[PDB]
Amino acid sequence: TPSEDFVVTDRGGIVENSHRVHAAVVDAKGRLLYALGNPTRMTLARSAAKPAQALAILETEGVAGYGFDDADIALMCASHSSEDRHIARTRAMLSKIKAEEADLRCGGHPSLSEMVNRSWIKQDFIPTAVCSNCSGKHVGMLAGARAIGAGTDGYHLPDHPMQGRVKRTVAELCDLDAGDVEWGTDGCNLPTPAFPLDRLGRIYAKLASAADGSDAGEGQSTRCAALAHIFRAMARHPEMVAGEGRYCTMLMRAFDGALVGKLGADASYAIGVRASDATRQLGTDGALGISVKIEDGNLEMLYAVVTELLERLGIGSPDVRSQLASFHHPQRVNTMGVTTGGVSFPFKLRG
Amino acid sequence: IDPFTMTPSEDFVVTDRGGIVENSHRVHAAVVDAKGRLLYALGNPTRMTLARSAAKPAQALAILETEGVAGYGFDDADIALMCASHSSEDRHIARTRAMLSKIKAEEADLRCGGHPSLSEMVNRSWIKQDFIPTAVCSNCSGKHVGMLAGARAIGAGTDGYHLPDHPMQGRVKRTVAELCDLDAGDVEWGTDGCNLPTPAFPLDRLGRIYAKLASAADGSDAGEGQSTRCAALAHIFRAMARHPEMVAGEGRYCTMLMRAFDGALVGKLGADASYAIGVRASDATRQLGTDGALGISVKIEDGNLEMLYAVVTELLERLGIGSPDVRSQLASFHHPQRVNTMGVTTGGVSFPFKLRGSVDDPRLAAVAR
Numbered sequence A: 001t002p003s004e005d006f007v008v009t010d011r012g013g014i015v016e017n018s019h020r021v022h023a024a025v026v027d028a029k030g031r032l033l034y035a036l037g038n039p040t041r042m043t044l045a046r047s048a049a050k051p052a053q054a055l056a057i058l059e060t061e062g063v064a065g066y067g068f069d070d071a072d073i074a075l076m077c078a079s080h081s082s083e084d085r086h087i088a089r090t091r092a093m094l095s096k097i098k099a100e101e102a103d104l105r106c107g108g109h110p111s112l113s114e115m116v117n118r119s120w121i122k123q124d125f126i127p128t129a130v131c132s133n134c135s136g137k138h139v140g141m142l143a144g145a146r147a148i149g150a151g152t153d154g155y156h157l158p159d160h161p162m163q164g165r166v167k168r169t170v171a172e173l174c175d176l177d178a179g180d181v182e183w184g185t186d187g188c189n190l191p192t193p194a195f196p197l198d199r200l201g202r203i204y205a206k207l208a209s210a211a212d213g214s215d216a217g218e219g220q221s222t223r224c225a226a227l228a229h230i231f232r233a234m235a236r237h238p239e240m241v242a243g244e245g246r247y248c249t250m251l252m253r254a255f256d257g258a259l260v261g262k263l264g265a266d267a268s269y270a271i272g273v274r275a276s277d278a279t280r281q282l283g284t285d286g287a288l289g290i291s292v293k294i295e296d297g298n299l300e301m302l303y304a305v306v307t308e309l310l311e312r313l314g315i316g317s318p319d320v321r322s323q324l325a326s327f328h329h330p331q332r333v334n335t336m337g338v339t340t341g342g343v344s345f346p347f348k349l350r351g
Numbered sequence B: 001i002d003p004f005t006m007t008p009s010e011d012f013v014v015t016d017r018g019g020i021v022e023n024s025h026r027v028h029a030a031v032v033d034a035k036g037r038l039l040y041a042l043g044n045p046t047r048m049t050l051a052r053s054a055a056k057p058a059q060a061l062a063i064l065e066t067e068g069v070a071g072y073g074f075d076d077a078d079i080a081l082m083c084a085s086h087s088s089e090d091r092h093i094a095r096t097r098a099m100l101s102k103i104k105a106e107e108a109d110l111r112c113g114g115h116p117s118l119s120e121m122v123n124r125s126w127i128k129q130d131f132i133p134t135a136v137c138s139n140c141s142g143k144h145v146g147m148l149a150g151a152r153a154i155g156a157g158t159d160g161y162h163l164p165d166h167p168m169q170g171r172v173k174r175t176v177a178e179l180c181d182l183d184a185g186d187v188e189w190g191t192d193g194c195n196l197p198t199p200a201f202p203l204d205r206l207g208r209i210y211a212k213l214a215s216a217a218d219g220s221d222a223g224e225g226q227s228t229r230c231a232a233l234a235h236i237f238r239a240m241a242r243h244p245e246m247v248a249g250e251g252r253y254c255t256m257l258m259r260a261f262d263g264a265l266v267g268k269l270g271a272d273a274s275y276a277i278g279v280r281a282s283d284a285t286r287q288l289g290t291d292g293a294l295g296i297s298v299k300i301e302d303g304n305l306e307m308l309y310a311v312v313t314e315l316l317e318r319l320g321i322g323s324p325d326v327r328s329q330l331a332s333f334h335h336p337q338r339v340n341t342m343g344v345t346t347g348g349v350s351f352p353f354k355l356r357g358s359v360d361d362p363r364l365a366a367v368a369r
């Protein structure tokens, strides 16, 4: 039943590569509104799960006492580029909980920004724990472990109360039983979840619906309040969520609060869209969630597809979306500056 | 699922994290004999495919068959560079300059452009020095010098040697079609990263080209009288196998593969994850059911290079080509490391594809896809 939905690159009209696309567009309750490919594909959310992990952090008893601010929370939600400012905020968050880099249980890695990495290579810099793109999430989990008086040495271990909280919080936001979320080990060495792709879109529709309810002044549950805070923090500090030149940062800056978006490693993407004229035209009375997976893991194709999807869905104005033109139709020019090909989207959204 | 209803559309290489599927990649492959007969396949063995740099031995043949080129005294290592996607190591740049000197041309005459090195270790050196690579650094620089050489030798004029209407490119186009045994209209052309025309043709015909390279080396080694074309194909095989480090560079798959096999085959990468291998006749080829040389071609549909090298190494194991000792020099490519930032292995690579050729119910259709 799932369609054969591809993004296709060409050289002079000749097919070069093709990439299978899965996508789910869901309403605030998770009802499926549109799809590409298999919208329930079992999928490792990777960093796209970080807002749910941030919720588990913020709901931990005592964490409020550390005084994390909106930018700090954004870093919790981040796959950052390890820019100097991300490292500086990581250290500033460590000081708030009276911890040090040696307490982190994540490891360093080449930067997610090629430009940052080239700067590191030029200076013989070896990245350390504090440079991890997940460093904000790890400081938050350290904070939560310290807050309830758990040991900090193994805050990252599955049998630690902090991961118990994380596991529970992910299943709850997905509206799934414990047994329907699978877990492996992330690149930062935390447990990391897999669940049907549509449930990733459900998380982000719940983020945006919470922001909507907070804007509207309602008897919001504390959990919705915290989801609303996470949404506001990501959209207020999108540079913390990724970095200069990064899709997530340029996307959220372009939309100036109308949505949040977040990358997952190996080419997953999630967007939470606040209710707008666009969502209403799409047939829902509330917020909307979008989740996308490129089957083979290609990031360049992910960003192209996501921006094409936003265009198909009518989300944003043409002028707003044109800020992402370089991601939507990636450059295909050779060493002599000649255009050799392009990218095409032969898929069709099914309602 | 069902082992008795498996299909080419299910030929995948798959990565996992703790057994949970991360990515999956469709595989296409063709294994052919020296006449192009299809012996084994994965996916769609006739997929229209841009050969990219895997066409370079065909381009090198067109260069070497250009009347007058023999006078320049290009040697075996020069020819291997014409066949190369090199790493832009200093020796590759130096040999490019040496070849330019042999034809009395200049770097300014190259019509290819620089790019980040194909080797991460070379590229790191460049980054430290803020070096901007130039034409002479192109991974295709040996091919371009050969094309310049051919243009000069025939009196054609060098300024547009890379353009489709230039005789050197007419010669390339004719030569590719001839080696593929295709009519001109069954080969399509686009423009490569190095700014030359680049061919696309059915994937099996890429294996056919390399089958012919290996077949020519067999005839040469055995002392058979050969056509000028077969003699030239045998020289190209010889050059690549004797100077595999010119064809790629240190740490590169093609180099390690050809060193490991020590003359038994040649192999060559094409950009966006194609691979071609020409295998001299051997006990292994005979057990696979042919009395001559063999060619192999592989394309990963989505273009992932790491998956290409794993698949190609798995395919050699499945074909019984090599020894476990020979192929174990390629172990790092065969099963790519999946180690996280804290030294913990998180997953791995698996090969749920099924070679077809020689078993199933006649009622199982093998729809190439």
Ligand SMILES: NC(=O)C[C@H](N)C(=O)O
Binding pocket: A046, A047, A048, A079, A133, A134, A186, A187, A188, A189, A263, A264, A265
């Ligand atoms: N951006 C990412 O998905 C990072 C991922 N959570 C990792 O640690 O590997």
Ligand SMILES: NC(=O)C[C@H](N)C(=O)O
Binding pocket: B051, B052, B053, B054, B085, B139, B140, B192, B193, B194, B195, B269, B270, B271, B272
């Ligand atoms: N390896 C490759 O295919 C290189 C390709 N011929 C290019 O133009 O760069």
